[PDB]
């Protein structure tokens, strides 16, 4: 027995928490990403990068704490602890935004580790690797939003900050600056997410209301046996119901469960593509035909033009505080405002 | 409004007047819908991962299931054996009824709250 | 020289036809506004 | 409205070419029996 094979043996022992070779990458990176977020949201400010308080220590609550992005002046610096910006000073590293890159990069390698773990366990147990494949969607979203998007922009400053409210701000930024709701790739993402939740609900309800009476109890959970070969619910009755209610129904259980994989995974992949475009400000911002008409015809009004006015409000009213490095000074008289408000 | 851009207009105005993003019932809606999409993919991928070999590489695996057959078409014990090791044993369902009830309840309850 | 043994027939069932047409038509319905712009 | 005139042929081929592909495959499936 060679040393490599003995380490393999140990890594792959059946224990309460399986380790694997993938564990060597996953477990440190996941725990560090998670610990960095808890550490930063509990103790670390965003005063010097953002002009914001962002920790429990400072008075924030669970909704407003964040690990915020580094200052725009850092560009796309890796912001290594030992790098030229922090120069090994942990305190300054925290104050400059180093925990952001720390979490994002450890988080990325942790995500790789997790998908490798899905591959590793699937190979050991003898199943097909479709759960790993499905997980590619969360990966694509993470890299496109947290990494590719800021890399096309001026700096990590414009990536999402890791916090509840900070992400809310990210949503609103994308509306006002990118008109992201108008983007067909986001729309396909919305359909895959909302379609997935629909499939989840309708499949679970269907199964639960087409059960075979396999026991005498009023609690029907007891009448299932994980080793029984029989289907626990009637595909035939399910199919009849939905055919008569909705017009069409599933008839093939394999297609049904593949479709459940397909819909949300595809939707997430589509949204990631749109965000790659927004990395370059390659937006679906306008319809040219609408703008030509509206410039010429002051009586022409649509929900599209109404929403651009809202975007314009968002940009002028949030930019000075949201982008402090720009030193925007907008006197009262230049702020867009409707009547009275 | 009954329209695509009208919908977005309604959402934006709602946020300005109600700060819906900072409202817990909408946060629960997101958890219901993100979680619903998550569990949709999870369940679809776990059942898909454990289909029993009934076909050749030259045909769609879907032809391994015939409408109204009495036998289950996947091995739920293998699915559980994979998912319980991916996390740990007791975070994985071995009871298909509880599993499908959970699938039903999570997004329904989340969407009740957001409504 | 013998005929090529690797040839296989290809299939698309009616349900796949309906699913694929719906996908294409809905995609067209979605993107056409952006093509006309 | 001043739309891109090429949007018509773009849309027409976007519908036509994939649809025809599927019809071709379906009809030759049926005639196999």
């Amino acid at each position: 027995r060679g040393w490599f094979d003995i380490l393999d043996d140990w890594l792959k022992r059946d224990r309460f928490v399986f380790v694997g070779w993938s564990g060597i990458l996953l477990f440190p990176c996941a725990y560090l990403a998670l610990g960095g977020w808890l550490t930063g949201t509990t103790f670390v400010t965003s005063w010097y990068t953002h002009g914001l308080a962002s920790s429990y220590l400072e008075g924030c609550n669970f909704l407003t704490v964040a690990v915020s992005t580094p200052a725009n002046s850092m560009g796309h610096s890796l912001l290594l602890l030992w790098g030229p910006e922090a120069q090994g000073d942990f305190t300054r590293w925290c104050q400059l935004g180093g925990l952001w890159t720390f979490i994002a990069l450890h988080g990325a390698f942790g995500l790789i580790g997790f998908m490798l773990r899905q591959f590793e366990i699937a190979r050991l147990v003898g199943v097909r690797p479709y759960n790993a494949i499905a997980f590619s969607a969360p990966i694509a979203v993470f890299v496109s939003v947290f990494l590719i998007y800021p890399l096309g922009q001026s700096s990590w400053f414009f990536a999402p900050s890791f916090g509840v409210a900070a992400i809310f701000r990210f949503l609103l930024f994308f509306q006002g600056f990118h008109n992201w709701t108008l983007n067909p790739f986001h729309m396909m993402g919305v359909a895959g997410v909302l379609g997935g939740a629909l499939l989840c609900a309708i499949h679970g309800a269907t199964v639960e209301n087409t059960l075979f009476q396999d026991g005498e109890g009023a609690s029907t959970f007891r009448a299932f046996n994980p080793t029984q070969a029989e289907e626990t619910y009637s595909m035939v009755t399910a199919n009849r119901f939905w055919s008569q209610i909705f017009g069409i129904a599933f008839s093939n259980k394999r297609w049904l469960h593949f479709f459940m994989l397909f819909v949300p995974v595809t939707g997430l992949w589509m949204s990631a593509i749109g965000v790659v475009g927004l990395a370059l400000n390659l937006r679906s911002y306008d319809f040219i035909s609408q703008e030509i008409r509206a410039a010429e015809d002051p009586e022409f009004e649509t929900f599209y033009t109404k929403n651009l006015l809202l975007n314009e409000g968002i940009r002028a009213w949030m930019a000075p505080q949201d982008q402090p490095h720009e030193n925007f000074v907008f006197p009262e008289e230049v702020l867009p405002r409707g009547n009275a408000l | 409004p009954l329209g695509i851009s009208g919908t977005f207009n309604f959402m934006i105005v709602f946020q300005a007047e109600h700060n819906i993003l900072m409202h817990p019932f909408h946060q629960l809606g997101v958890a219901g819908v993100f979680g619903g999409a998550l569990f949709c993919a999870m369940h679809g991928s776990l059942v898909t991962s454990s289909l029993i070999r009934e076909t050749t590489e030259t045909e769609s695996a879907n032809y391994g299931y015939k409408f109204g057959q009495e036998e289950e078409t996947y091995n739920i014990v293998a699915a559980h054996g994979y998912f319980g090791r991916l996390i740990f044993q007791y975070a994985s369902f071995n009871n298909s009824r509880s599993l499908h009830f959970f699938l039903a309840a999570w997004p329904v309850v989340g969407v009740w709250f957001t409504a | 020289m013998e005929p090529n043994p690797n040839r296989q027939p290809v299939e698309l069932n009616r349900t796949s036809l309906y699913l694929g047409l719906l996908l294409i038509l809905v995609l067209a319905l979605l993107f056409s506004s952006y093509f006309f712009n | 409205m001043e739309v891109n005139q090429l949007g018509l042929i773009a849309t027409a081929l976007f519908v036509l070419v994939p649809s025809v592909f599927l019809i071709i495959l379906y009809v030759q499936t049926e005639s196999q029996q």
Binding site: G247 | - | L25, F36 | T11, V15
Partner: peptide
């Protein structure tokens, strides 16, 4: 021309619904 195109595609989808429901491949047991 753009209006015609939008309504044409919409109409094709409605027609597809008809065929998919009434001219579906019939599900057959075992």
């Amino acid at each position: 021309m753009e209006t015609i195109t939008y309504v044409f595609i919409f109409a094709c989808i409605i027609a597809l619904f008809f065929f998919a429901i009434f001219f579906r491949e019939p599900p057959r047991i075992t």
